[PDB]
Design a protein around this ligand. Structure first.
Ligand SMILES: CNc1cc(F)cc2c1[nH]c1nc(Oc3cnc(C)nc3)nc(N3C[C@H]4CCN[C@H]4C3)c12
Ligand SMILES: CNc1cc(F)cc2c1[nH]c1nc(Oc3cnc(C)nc3)nc(N3C[C@H]4CCN[C@H]4C3)c12
Lengths: 191, 189
């Protein structure tokens, strides 16, 4: 289960001591958003570096189903990963969840906003309604585990910008915005 | 957990029913040869479509280390290339192969190990002497995993191998197709 992931994190996400695994965390989440974009439902993905050691990835696709919820299953249980050109394989978002000190899932779907929080891949409470909306999509925001990641524990604009540009080229037509609230930088990638 | 790979191959290798996964199996092995080229040791890679439902990939790099189980066995059995299949290793190919053969030329000896469904048939063994170095992986896809397209197709391999050679400039890749009597050579600098 996720216990195995927490025990041997580098095996599942990449080197935890040089920033490689840390940035893979973001790219794995981005891969899920691109997948939803390529399915024709998402027209815009937004990746944001926040000033609190989190990154969020937001799409305006269908929203993960919420009726535990299918969403919780997706987040917690350790599927074609080849729809996304340049996508990571052999990892799902549950690995990112396991290796996050906190992860926040916000889903806009069927008129409601739903939210669930996890810590180290363990939910705090059942998915709950937190608003109403006519919009749709999925937002994952996570704070990396500081037990897991060392030396490079903060997300770096240049690493994210370089890879997101590459992913936008490899998956032509997908629009990715990178917003960096910590550093006051922004980019739009779209080919 | 190779059983996990067999049970749910989609995350690891892709679609198993339309030939895309099947060909990813070849590209994963080729990625390992390209890695050895990027490391500055392999100059030439030979990809061969055999007439027995197998593909071999041979390089002329250092050869996977064989000391002790051997380091080679761990790579095959335990779960930087541009266009590489990121996050998967050759143990995934092994898991989803009916048979896989590893032949290593290293330190003056030829070493061989065979696997069935990712489980070794015997301990790595010496099978010859050589002045050459390199790694050869030859595999036969599992028909319990792959359906509909279960044979390797020249055009799919030719297209992607040309791309991989361009994306990883310097390495020479030969595609030999003994089943169909076709050959090509890809090399960019
Ligand atoms: C930051 N965004 C983000 C982040 C994220 F971690 C996951 C999703 C995610 N956006 C998503 N959108 C959908 O949309 C779907 C809705 N309904 C179905 C049947 N499939 C997909 N599904 C999602 N799922 C369900 C699985 C299908 C393929 N990938 C898995 C994750 C996501
Ligand atoms: C068809 N070819 C092929 C196929 C294949 F499946 C594996 C290799 C392979 N060729 C290889 N050559 C080396 O060479 C090395 C020797 N010594 C060291 C320290 N590193 C690499 N290592 C190999 N290894 C060891 C790991 C390093 C990165 N990739 C893993 C697989 C391969």
């Amino acid at each position: 289960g996720l216990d195995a992931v927490r025990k041997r994190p580098g095996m599942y996400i990449g080197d935890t001591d040089d920033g490689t695994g840390l940035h893979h965390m973001v790219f794995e989440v981005v891969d899920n958003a691109i997948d939803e974009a390529l399915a024709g439902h998402c027209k815009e993905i937004i990746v944001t570096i926040h000033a609190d050691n989190s990154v969020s990835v937001q799409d305006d696709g269908r929203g993960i189903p919420t009726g535990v919820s299918a969403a919780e299953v997706i987040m917690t249980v350790l599927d074609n990963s080849y729809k996304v050109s340049g996508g990571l394989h052999g990892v799902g978002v549950s690995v990112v969840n396991a290796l996050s000190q906190k992860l926040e899932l916000v889903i806009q779907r069927e008129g409601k906003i739903h939210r669930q929080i996890y810590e180290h891949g363990v939910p705090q409470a059942p998915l709950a309604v937190t608003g109403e909306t006519e919009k749709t999509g999925t937002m994952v925001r996570f704070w990396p585990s500081l037990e897991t990641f060392t030396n490079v524990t903060e997300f770096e604009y240049e690493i994210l910008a370089k890879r997101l540009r590459e992913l936008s080229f490899l998956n032509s037509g997908v629009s990715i915005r990178l917003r960096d609230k910590r550093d006051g930088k922004e980019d739009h990638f779209h080919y």
